[PDB]
Amino acid sequence: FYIETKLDGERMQMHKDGDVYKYFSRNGYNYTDQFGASPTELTPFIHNAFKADIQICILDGEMMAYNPNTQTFMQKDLQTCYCVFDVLMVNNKKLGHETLRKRYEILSSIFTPIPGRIEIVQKT
């Protein structure tokens, strides 16, 4: 059977171009100083799980913190995790025309998750 879970966190966006990435808030703001602009530097980690020909990408999501030993998201110290529910542009291709159906499905195409640091979720 199945259990569903309503969660919320800090809405952020990620831009990706070939090892150089940027971090934008809801309002927009540069949070690249919190997470990081390259793999050497709060989520270097995520850097390599990406499919091949993906080089440039935009991904909408919301930023969560989880507890490793408890394997759950604390929503009431720990580690930062990005739960990504959408994609806008990737590999030159900005498709906002496609239904969110299509963009979520496509999301499987972009990456592969690390659990507890960057999973994937539904906006529903």
Author numbering: 268 to 308, 311 to 345, 359 to 406
From the paper:
We crystallized a subdomain of NTase (NTase-3) of human LigIV and solved the structure at the resolution of 2.9 Å using SAD and SIRAS methods (see Experimental Procedures for the details). The structure revealed an overall architecture of the NTase-3 of LigIV that is similar to that of LigI (Pascal et al., 2004) and LigIII (Cotner-Gohara et al., 2010). LigIV has a six amino acid insert, which is relatively acidic, between β2 and 310 defined by residues of low conservation across species. The relative arrangement of motifs I, III, and IIIa resembles that of the other human DNA ligases, suggesting that LigIV carries out DNA ligation in a conventional manner. NTase-3 of DNA ligases has a DNA-binding region and loop immediately after β1 (D1) and the other between β3 and β4. The latter is mostly disordered in the crystals studied here. With the exception of a few organisms in which histidines and phenylalanines are located in the equivalent position (data not shown), Y298 is conserved among LigIVs suggesting that this residue may play a role in DNA binding. R278, Q280, and H282, mutations of which cause LIG4 syndrome, are located on β1 in the same way as the equivalent residues of LigI and LigIII. Some organisms have phenylalanine instead of tyrosine at this position. This tyrosine residue forms a part of the hydrophobic core of the NTase-3 domain and a hydrogen bond with H316, suggesting that the mouse Y288C substitution impairs the stability of NTase-3.
